[PDB]
């Protein structure tokens, strides 16, 4: 409407106090129009009146900021000074008024100041400072002068300006900082300055610190900030000021200052120790951040200046103090976590040095790192069982993440200390075992666990020694139990090269397998060892298979771990003589083939389904890892089980969950057996066709594709697959017609299968039962599906389809008859209907048409581009002719076609 103080003020009331959202949004949108209007230059000053409540006053102040910041071109140059004055007056007015309106008017003045420099206002800072020293009490004027100086930099940071413009402003701004700092230093060194003024001063200092002013100009203020760390009220602000000042990107430009800061950091040691003594965590946390900020960010630069090495070394020890601060993380302290990245940096820097620097610094820090190892293991240690109970879920999680971080730290400490770290561990563990809380023992093992995978195999003579100590530990806790298992799993690869030690670690793993509370850890470790040492585990295969069978019979493991255990056994058996595989396969499956049978003759139930599925799962998981090739026990087992399998299909041919578990058993079998699976083809195809008809699933198409690929060359076995191929297509096509976009996954797989057929068994498209026209129709519609996977697959089908032009009659007829349809879909995609991500894919279809269907392509493109606004409204007739001329080139590298499509698709979109 019309923007008057009366109307704008009524809208503020509605937004502020009308409880109804609808209205508010209305009031907000109306106010958004009013704030940018020309009337704002008139009603904003009116909303600042004493009668308007603070909130309403704020809108006026805020609107003034918008007009200057936004519509600076509404002011004439002669009015700059007058406008200037009006705002200084208003700021003095509100130095004793509402705090929110003060800040808001300060931002407005700062916007005008910046717009002014460099020339329109030579000394913005000098003028501001001089005017406030001149109605108000000293404290109110000082806080107001600081508010203004603090917001100035913050507005620059948000000022959206031109590289050219911005540089000039930044430049003048760096000069203006010469007047700001002096003032700030004054206020801090004046004992008459009140705590509130000190806080704003530090805050002001941090604001200019973000402007990246030279670290040297900060020495005076940084030193004052350090001193303020003594005052409880000022702690927060100065910690933030110091850290930001030291963390500046170019602070590294002034290495000298940094050296001068080290002592200021070391001076805090007393305060830090006291905070630890009193238990004040907030404080140790802050001092640690400061110390870490200096040493972490300038470690190498400080190490380069060798003459000061002693100063740096003290700093390193201070950090070591925080890394090892007394108490448990993070219940008693949260400081140690701040220092972990540091130990990575320090070590990395020393290794970087060469010759004398590396060698001499190594003599200096090798002992420091051994001390750290001692400190890290104490911190990775769990609190007493009682104390742990009081920990919240969150506190426990923070300590788990904390231990993971220590593992990475230990992994690097390893690279710094080498094999002497391993010997150090052996002595600590050995000592504790013979010279006893699980916590203390578990931590030492954890140390070994975190370093176990990284260990070279070259300095591993110490490793055997350690493996020996494990079997001597008293496993009194579940936590220690897992650590022991994980450590053994971590050494899985090392054991594959040192088979004698298997004997020592295996008994422990096989024993843990019977305790459900240790199910996840024991089964994962058994799987790892079984995968790594299968060739050296043939002798023990007998014992392993026995303990696994027993454990299964006792329901000791949850389904997911039952499957891992089966995979584990797959590996194990793949390494035994065929005769042995057979004796064990029966031992494993006989006891379940029985349960399956009782279950097959049972009437389908919810509980009946979970059981039938779990048993099938065991089999498919067993056959995934059991590849004898890289007799046929699996084949015999298949033939024998197939009889029962069919039984299950009869009552569950309609279960989605079951029909796929069965599919999986054949998927994993075919991937393991491959060509040797030939016997089963005939039976499998018959079973798959029925499965697919009843309940179609991508998985079935995928297995069909696996079959086609595998038996495409041998015509003896292929006949059954051909039958399956046709059936599956018939069913998929008809299901596609009902709701084409309802099964992205099936369409995807279907396209992949079809392409596979075209690639390995082309003639298959000659089958009279095949509907080539419908297939081509399905592929063309699929290109317009939302899903990338489904589209890529469709493109892939056409990529293979076209080269078969003139090779197979059927494919030639369809491309000639409906190919225009394909091309149009392709141009629609390039025009913009397809993700830019798929452009390369569509370009492939064009290349294929250029090489194989040129005469048709040439004709189709001219017809398809004649219409204006297609493929895009943005395309000029000239542009269309440029593209078609480029695509109709008879000679072109596929690498170029993608380029043409890239360039073109950009024009269509903008």
């Amino acid at each position: 409407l019309d923007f008057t103080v009366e109307n704008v003020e009524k809208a503020l009331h509605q937004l502020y106090y009308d409880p109804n959202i609808e209205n508010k949004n209305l009031a907000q949108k109306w106010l958004m129009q009013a704030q940018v209007s020309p009337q704002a230059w008139h009603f904003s000053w009116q909303l600042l009146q004493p009668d308007k409540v603070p909130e309403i006053q704020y809108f006026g102040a805020s609107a003034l900021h918008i007009k200057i910041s936004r519509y600076w071109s509404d002011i004439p140059t002669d009015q700059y000074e007058s406008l200037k004055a009006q705002l200084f007056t208003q700021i003095t007015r509100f130095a004793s008024g509402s705090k929110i309106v003060l800040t808001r008017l300060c931002v407005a003045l700062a916007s005008l100041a910046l717009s002014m420099m460099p020339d329109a206002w030579p000394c913005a800072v000098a003028d501001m400072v001089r005017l406030f020293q001149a109605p108000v009490d000293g404290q109110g004027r000082c806080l107001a002068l600081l508010e203004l100086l603090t917001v100035l930099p913050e507005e620059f940071q948000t000022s959206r300006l031109p590289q050219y413009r911005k540089g000039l402003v930044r430049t003048s701004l760096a000069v203006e900082c010469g007047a700001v700092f002096p003032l700030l230093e004054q206020l801090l060194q004046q004992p008459s300055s009140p705590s509130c003024v000190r806080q704003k001063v530090l805050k002001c200092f941090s604001s200019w610190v973000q402007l990246e002013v030279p670290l040297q100009d900060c020495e005076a203020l940084i030193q004052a900030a350090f001193a303020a760390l003594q005052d409880s009220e000022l702690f927060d602000s100065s910690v933030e000021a110091i850290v930001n000042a030291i963390s500046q990107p170019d602070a590294q430009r002034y290495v000298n200052t940094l050296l001068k800061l080290i002592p200021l950091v070391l001076g805090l040691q007393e305060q830090l120790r006291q905070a630890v003594q009193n238990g004040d965590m907030e404080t140790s946390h802050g001092i640690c951040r400061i110390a870490v900020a200096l040493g972490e960010n300038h470690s190498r630069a400080l190490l380069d200046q060798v003459e000061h090495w002693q100063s740096f070394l003290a700093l390193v020890n201070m950090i070591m103090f925080c890394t090892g601060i007394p108490g448990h993380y993070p219940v008693n302290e949260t400081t140690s976590s701040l220092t972990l990245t540091f130990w990575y940096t320090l070590q990395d820097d020393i290794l970087s040095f060469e010759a004398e620097k590396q060698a001499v610094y190594q003599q200096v820090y090798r002992p420091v790192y051994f001390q750290l190892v001692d400190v890290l293991l104490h911190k990775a240690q769990f609190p007493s069982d009682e104390e742990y109970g009081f920990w919240s879920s969150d506190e426990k999680e923070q300590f788990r993440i904390y231990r993971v971080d220590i593992s990475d730290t230990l992994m690097y400490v390893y690279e710094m200390l080498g094999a002497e770290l391993l010997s150090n561990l052996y002595d600590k563990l050995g000592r504790l075992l013979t010279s006893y809380s699980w916590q203390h023992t578990e931590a030492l093992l954890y140390g070994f666990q975190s370093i176990a995978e990284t260990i070279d195999v070259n300095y591993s003579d110490v490793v055997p020694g350690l493996i020996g100590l494990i079997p001597r530990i008293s496993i009194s806790n579940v936590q220690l139990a897992d650590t022991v298992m994980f450590t053994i799993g971590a050494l899985s690869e090392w054991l594959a090269d040192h088979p004698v030690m298997i004997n020592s670690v295996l008994p422990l793993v096989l024993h843990a397998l019977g305790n459900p509370e240790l199910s996840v850890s024991s089964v994962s470790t058994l799987k790892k060892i079984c995968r790594e040492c299968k060739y050296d585990l043939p002798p023990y295969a007998a014992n392993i298979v026995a303990v696994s069978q027993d454990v299964l019979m006792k329901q000791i493991h949850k389904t997911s771990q039952c499957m891992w255990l089966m995979q584990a056994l797959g590996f194990l058996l793949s390494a035994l003589q065929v005769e042995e595989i057979l004796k064990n396969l029966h031992s494993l499956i006989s006891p379940y083939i029985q349960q399956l049978e009782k279950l097959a003759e049972e009437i389908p139930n919810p509980s009946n389904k979970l059981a039938i599925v779990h048993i099938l799962g065991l089999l498919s998981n067993l056959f995934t890892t059991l590849d004898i090739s890289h007799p046929n026990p699996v084949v015999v087992v298949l033939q024998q089980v197939f009889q029962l399998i069919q039984k299950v299909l009869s009552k569950w041919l309609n279960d989605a969950q079951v029909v796929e578990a069965v599919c999986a058993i054949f998927e994993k079998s075919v991937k393991t057996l491959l060509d040797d699976f030939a016997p089963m083809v005939p039976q499998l195809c018959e079973m798959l066709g029925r499965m697919y008809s009843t309940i179609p699933q991508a998985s079935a198409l995928d297995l069909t594709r696996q079959l086609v690929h595998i038996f495409a060359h041998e015509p003896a076995h292929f006949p059954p697959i051909e039958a399956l191929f046709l059936l599956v297509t018939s069913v998929t096509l008809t299901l596609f017609q009902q709701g084409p976009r309802d099964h992205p996954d099936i369409v995807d797989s279907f396209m992949q299968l079809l392409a596979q057929a075209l690639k390995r068994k082309p003639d298959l498209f000659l089958c009279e039962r095949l509907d080539v026209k419908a297939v081509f129709q399905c592929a063309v519609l699929a290109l317009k599906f939302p899903e990338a996977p489904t589209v890529k697959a469709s493109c892939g089908f056409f990529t293979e389809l076209l080269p078969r032009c003139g090779e197979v009659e059927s494919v030639g007829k369809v491309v000639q008859e409906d190919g225009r349809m394909l091309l149009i879909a392709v141009l629609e995609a390039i025009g913009g209907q397809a993700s830019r991500s798929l452009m390369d894919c569509f370009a492939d279809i064009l290349f294929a048409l250029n090489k194989h269907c040129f005469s048709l392509l040439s004709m189709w493109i001219k017809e398809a581009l004649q219409p204006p606004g297609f493929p895009s409204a943005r395309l000029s007739p000239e542009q269309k002719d440029t593209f078609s001329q480029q695509i109709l080139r008879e000679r072109v590298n596929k690498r170029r076609v993608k380029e043409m499509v890239k360039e073109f698709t950009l024009l269509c979109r903008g």
């Binding site: 909130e55 802050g286 990245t341 971080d405």
Partner: protein
């Protein structure tokens, strides 16, 4: 692209680990793969000492888009909080978290969180995201503070 973002988030993680405000927590989540996810962080902001928010620990999720750090990340409190600038969905309405307002690609994770913690004690009245809380804050401050103190107690650590 996505890689550019992921690398910058790895950096933010390293900086947050070495330098972050006492009481705060920012941690990436783990994918189903078990792999670490830098696009989704689980954070918790403590109430400023000396305010009605003191004592409470307010959890929030930080989600990143593949255009980070060009576009600010979406921050959302879980569960939603009683507050003027917090949408009922939990999303925080803050100018630096708006790509077209103040978000600068340079803003760090420490800055975002500190900015949100400041916004807790001081509601920006320029934009209402919750009708009641935003109204009660303007209309009756005594009731506002009463509820906020109850909330702070509700999210006290246990």
């Amino acid at each position: 692209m996505s890689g550019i973002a992921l690398s910058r988030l790895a950096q933010e993680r390293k900086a947050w680990r070495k330098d972050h405000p006492f009481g705060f927590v920012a941690v990436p989540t783990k994918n189903p793969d078990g792999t670490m996810n830098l696009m989704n962080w689980e954070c918790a902001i403590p109430g400023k000492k000396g305010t009605p928010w003191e004592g409470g620990l307010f959890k929030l999720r930080m989600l990143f888009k593949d255009d980070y750090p060009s576009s600010p990340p979406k921050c959302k409190f879980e569960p939603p909080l009683f507050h003027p600038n917090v949408y009922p969905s939990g999303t925080v309405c803050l100018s630096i978290l708006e790509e077209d307002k103040d978000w600068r690609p340079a803003i760090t994770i420490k800055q975002i969180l500190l900015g949100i913690q400041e916004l807790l004690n001081e509601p920006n009245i320029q934009d209402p995201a919750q009708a009641e809380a935003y109204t009660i804050y303007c209309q009756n401050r005594v009731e506002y503070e009463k509820r906020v103190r109850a909330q702070a107690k509700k999210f006290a650590p246990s």
